[PDB]
């Protein structure tokens, strides 16, 4: 009911924290990737859209 | 050995049959033609 307790002395401290910010930010060849670099199954995949 | 692979199954060695040869492959080139322009509204020069 009545007793509290105080600091007498400190410390200072230091800590870290890692945090990611950023990625790797890749683009992809979308035809090169699916077709392959050299093919009229290019000419077929524009017909997906 | 012949030729040989990367990590992931992609070609990128060969030997020359007739001769020895450890000749190395690469792909061709490529990338994403990105075109810098000030608008249509300023001018109609580009670059690339």
């Given at each position: 009911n009545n007793s509290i307790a105080i600091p007498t002395n400190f410390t200072i401290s230091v800590t870290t924290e890692i945090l990611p910010v950023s990625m790797t930010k890749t683009s992809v060849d979308c035809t090169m990737y699916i077709?392959?670099?050299?093919?009229?199954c290019s000419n077929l995949l524009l017909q997906y859209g | 050995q012949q030729f040989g692979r990367d990590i992931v199954d992609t070609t990128d060695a060969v030997r020359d049959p007739q001769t020895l040869e450890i000749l190395d492959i690469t792909p061709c080139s490529f990338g994403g033609v990105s075109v810098i322009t000030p608008g249509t509204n300023t001018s109609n020069q580009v670059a690339v």
């Open positions: 077709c392959g670099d050299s093919t009229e | -």
